[PDB]
């Protein structure tokens, strides 16, 4: 049985379903593969196409996991879709009313056409299994757990009916306890939250980063006048009939200013994020309190979007309510639809289910074989030096005991969105002023969230409280306290409340990261590192050796381990031989606005990306021209010939542009199909 | 006692409050002034920057309004604004979470600032009264019907707490009986079902045209799982909870299929339309009959966006329900602005109200005086021909008789979406084939779309059933039955199920289209002509002589009378003279997406309308250089130059996108204040 899991939606590389898509229609779109009931390969697509949390269809993502499998697109037994059929056929269409041009295609004909026409498969219609969407989510939070049954918690935005369900798991069967409707979301109610403090679809991380630093006793009886906590496990969000969100017009009847961007957080921000972490904390806990004495289970599986809240999850383990807590590295729709996959499979017949707990993410595309990534090394030489170390782990633990920042690439990338020791930036994790220091490497602003610390399974609770029961901790999914005798020791990666968001790497989940971090901790005496994604603010973890090379050119990184090369950035780097290529959403654009006098007005050009929510930017009339001549082939030096040479201020807007990821700036040609290194 | 009512949104000509701010955020902007209790003066922003049911700041409304009345900002004592001042905050309150760039503004600064640059008019906080949206309304709708009390029916999308109201009014006295929660708005039920048609905001008057065409029996019972009629005149709406609209999933389920843009409507479509004018006839006769009985009026006053339902007023009419019925020609939200400045004034003072019901909607601005137009008029010379008959009735009437289709325009425009004898398009209203070319070639519409009549007062009960209560038909209203022995005569306003939306016009509600009318009776025997709105299907309602001449050389009119000028186009119009400004809102664009290899794609050149809705066109690469050079004071001819000349091709491309009002196309000045 082999068995691929689709979540998202079904737009093309370069266009969306209708125009401007909204970002929150079936995002975090992925591709899962199953066989004989194991995870065999996932990726999301918005590390192929470069678009985080993207709602395009995942046809990249679909490629590279057949060509991990060694399977033909005709060797796929089914196809499990995250949601019913009815339900995601019944938003397209109301997307069809309001867009009268777009064609009546639905998603079974959509999945069909996207499949025939990016892979050359003819996808039976009785091979394709729609799935209710918490199902999958159970199914996939649940398999992975390594447990013989649980009770299982799903709670999201929503899926088809409801915003969260609870199951009762044995072997291989869900059973439905309970349910909660679509308006009681606290998926919801934290993304409506979430807009109050500036932030946006995806932000909710930053949101729990921050509340920490406030109050939340000033906005708790603010909070209290939107839910009500009931009897048996029962909840009430009281909602308003003024505008679509939960949140907003209390507040501002109370006099709240919702943060504009640039603007630091306020006092009143600070505060408002603590009473909106404290209020899902106590509803969750009430349903879990209630659920865990019905059900009398010891043994806790958590799903769906909400269970990336790590501070949520470190309390529920705290509670002392279960034993045992799981939650998978992809909680979120892209672990629904692996989820998907083994409904399928379950309801085309049998369900053959994983044999251990999982312990790795690591199931993406690698970055390639030796010997294509040497060659590839070698085509980015005009902007790199390469050493290749005789043991590199050793070279590369040496290096961070010395205070430098290293990007740290390895095999296949990480499947959810924390970096685990394959697509990583690590550094020291003791002094304090690595927080400042890295965020302004990565160009992020988020000096009020700390970094999350990777210590060995040997020495973790020589620093970490992990004390409750007994969670999973191969993927950051508990913030958990430092003792208190260490928290000066691990400057970097302890929270202002004593907290952090802990990977335990073992032997087993990480070796060749286990052994950097016990070769660090003998080095210094101390085994823990900080463990950051490796991204810059405009783009999702890398995935490729040119995505990994670029994002390393484009930042204040100290060094790249890549695959066992050690790579630096030359002291002026060659932008001139780089070959830049459209993105399939990049747009260059000449605008005239109306001027005085009804006249035609300013004259401006930009660049931006055609998608919700995209970046743009000015560009110069010569990097105008310049850009306008891209043809895929010709390198950049070529091209500024025609506006005069690669002066240092073109290169230098280039270079601001290629940060963006405004267009793709990469030496010729490519790595080449990622060799079978016979690791299957 | 000078009171102006204001409604709308408040952004800027050329932006938005925020960006692409929906067309749906308080829409249909305009301004009335109340003097001494009578309606001095009212028009729609839409009028006057030319974007149908604009979301815009209603400022040059305003100033218009002020001219007409022959009053300075200082002479306005209270300024009335149509909805609840927390309600409004909320709503920007959330676009600005949505969008962290826009500075904190809420509804009172922002009216405030518009002022102030706008009229510079300094606004004292005392004396901006915000009102009830559904109040707002009902002032409107009932202190203009001439009555001193009357049941008052509000159903609109919504205001800020409920769909649809119900109040008694006595005197200047309304109090409330009745409202009911904003899900079973029958607004938004009806919109929703609009966008299964294709169609969007603004188009409900067209799926009321289309559903005579259909049968209702065939989506009746789908329709039916949707609303229950309860007992003492209540109902329900059933929602879901899969999207935002009512109406699409439970017709997605049953095999529907929503209609695409640009493809014909199916007899399955005609069905939904007839089936979903049956479902809210149904509804609010159901309201009707129960607060009819319950309160003991005898008369309806009927206001709210639902109240320009012209088939559901017929029926209420027919219903013998009341003795009288009343609807404001303004009866959108436009017309809540106006009852804005009636309750502002109430709670400042007591109220003065209409001495009379209110027969003429002839509002907005003029055209201008004599000597302004005819000098006017001059400036257009190399495109038009001009003629003075002695008589421009006498010669427009003969002009109908032998088949000609004639633009109107006279005196002060239209309030309200109907044109009524003062921005209108008027023709023979007894051949068939009138309806038919109309529709295509010159309104350029759909095949389906009924044409209205005008008749005189005396020649009314000839034509038309208007038995059942007494309504008012100064501003067609109501939907009645033609006579079933005059169908054959009255060809192409008699729409399929033998209806029309008349307008009865007599020597008080509009003299000199009365005097139109009845000589043209006079010359053929039938005192009825077909009366369309005066605009292009790019446009409002035409306002200015400027819009009025632009309209008539850009759609397929025979001749124009305006003020007594008989205005034709000449044989070959020379479109150099004219000189090109960008609208506030134009936007020229060279583009290019991604092409082959990840190259940059061809380049593409586009005019387009930046606002929610706003159209597009590709240009030329020569037009768009041209474009390019714009400057509002040179020639089209001129800027030509540059590109080579005013060549045929670039001419004909130009006139294209002068019909869908990309930009202003006009002689080289204006025709000054009016
Ligand atoms: N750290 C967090 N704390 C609270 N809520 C979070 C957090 N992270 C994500 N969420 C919420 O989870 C929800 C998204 O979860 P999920 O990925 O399972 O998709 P979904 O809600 O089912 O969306 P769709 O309707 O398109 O399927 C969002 O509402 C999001 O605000
Ligand atoms: N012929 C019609 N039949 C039924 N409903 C109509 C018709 N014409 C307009 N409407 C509805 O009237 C409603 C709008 O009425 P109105 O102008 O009074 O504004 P509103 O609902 O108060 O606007 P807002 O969105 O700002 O609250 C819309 O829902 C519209 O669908
Ligand atoms: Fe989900
Ligand atoms: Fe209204």
Redesign the pocket.
């Given at each position: 049985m082999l068995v691929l899991g689709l979540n998202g939606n079904f737009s093309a590389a370069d266009t969306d379903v209708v125009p401007q898509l909204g970002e929150?229609?079936?995002?975090?779109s992925a591709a899962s593969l199953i066989r004989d009931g194991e995870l065999v390969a996932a990726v999301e697509e918005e590390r192929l196409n470069r678009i985080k949390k993207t709602t395009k269809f995942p046809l990249n993502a679909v490629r590279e996991c057949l060509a991990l499998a060694g399977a033909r697109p005709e060797d796929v037994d089914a196809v499990g879709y995250?949601?019913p059929e009815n339900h995601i056929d019944t938003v397209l269409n109301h997307l069809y009313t309001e867009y009268p041009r777009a064609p009546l295609r639905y998603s079974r004909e959509l999945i069909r056409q996207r499949l025939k026409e990016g892979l050359g498969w003819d996808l039976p219609d009785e091979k394709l299994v729609y799935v209710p969407?918490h199902e999958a989510?159970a199914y996939s939070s649940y398999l992975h757990s390594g447990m013989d049954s649980a009770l299982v918690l799903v709670?999201?935005?929503?899926?088809e009916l409801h915003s969260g369900t609870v199951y009762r798991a044995e072997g291989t069967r869900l059973e439905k306890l309970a349910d909660y409707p679509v308006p009681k979301?606290?998926?919801?109610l934290?993304?409506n939250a979430?807009y109050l403090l500036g932030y946006g679809?995806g932000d909710?991380?930053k949101?729990?980063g921050l509340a920490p630093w406030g109050n939340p006793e000033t906005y708790r009886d603010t909070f209290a006048k939107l839910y009500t906590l009931q009897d048996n496990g029962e909840y009430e969000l009281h909602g308003n009939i003024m505008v679509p969100n939960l949140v907003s017009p209390l507040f501002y009847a109370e006099g709240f200013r919702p943060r504009r961007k640039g603007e630091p957080f306020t006092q009143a921000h600070r505060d408002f994020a603590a009473a909106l972490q404290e209020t899902?904390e106590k509803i969750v806990l009430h349903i879990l309190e209630y659920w865990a004495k019905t059900s009398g289970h010891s043994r806790l599986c958590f799903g769906?979007?909400?269970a990336?809240?790590?501070?949520?999850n470190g309390l529920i383990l705290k509670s002392g309510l279960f034993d045992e807590v799981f939650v998978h590295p992809a909680?979120?729709?892209?672990g629904?639809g692996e989820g998907a996959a083994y409904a399928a499979a379950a309801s085309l017949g049998t369900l053959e289910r994983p044999g251990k707990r999982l312990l790795s993410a690591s199931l993406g595309p690698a970055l390639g074989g030796r010997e294509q990534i040497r060659a590839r090394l070698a085509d980015w030489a005009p902007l790199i030096d390469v050493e290749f170390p005789d043991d590199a782990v050793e070279t590369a633990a040496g290096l961070l005991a010395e205070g430098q920042v290293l990007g740290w690439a390895y095999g296949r990338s990480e499947f959810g969105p924390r970096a685990l020791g394959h697509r990583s930036i690590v550094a020291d994790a003791r002094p304090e002023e690595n927080r400042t220091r890295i965020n302004a490497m990565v160009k992020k602003r988020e000096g009020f969230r700390p970094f999350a610390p990777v210590v060995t399974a040997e020495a973790a609770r020589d620093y970490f409280d992990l004390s409750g029961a007994d969670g999973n901790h191969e993927f950051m999914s508990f913030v958990v306290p430092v003792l208190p005798e260490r928290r000066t020791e691990l400057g970097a990666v302890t929270h202002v409340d004593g907290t952090a968001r802990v990977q335990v790497v073992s032997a087993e989940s990480g070796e060749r990261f286990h052994r950097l971090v016990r070769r660090f901790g003998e080095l210094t005496g101390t085994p823990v590192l900080l463990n950051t994604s490796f991204n810059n603010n405009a783009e999702p973890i890398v995935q490729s050796l040119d995505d990994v090379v670029t994002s390393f050119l484009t930042t204040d990184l100290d060094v790249l381990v890549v695959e066992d090369c050690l790579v630096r950035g030359k002291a002026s780097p060659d932008l001139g031989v780089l070959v830049p290529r459209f993105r399939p959403v990049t747009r260059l654009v000449e605008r005239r606005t109306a001027g005085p006098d009804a006249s035609a007005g300013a004259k401006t050009h930009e660049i931006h990306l055609d998608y919700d929510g995209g970046p743009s930017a000015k560009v110069s009339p010569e990097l105008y021209e310049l850009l306008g001549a891209v043809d895929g082939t010709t390198t950049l030096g070529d091209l500024a010939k025609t506006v005069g040479g690669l002066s240092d201020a073109l290169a230098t807007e280039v270079f601001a542009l290629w940060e963006q990821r405004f267009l793709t700036l990469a030496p010729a040609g490519d790595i080449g199909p990622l060799a079978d290194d016979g690791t299957r």
């Open positions: 929150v229609f079936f995002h975090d995250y949601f969407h989510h709670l999201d935005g929503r899926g979301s606290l998926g919801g934290y993304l979430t679809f909710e991380y949101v729990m899902v769906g979007g909400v990336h809240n790590s501070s949520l909680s979120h729709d892209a629904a």
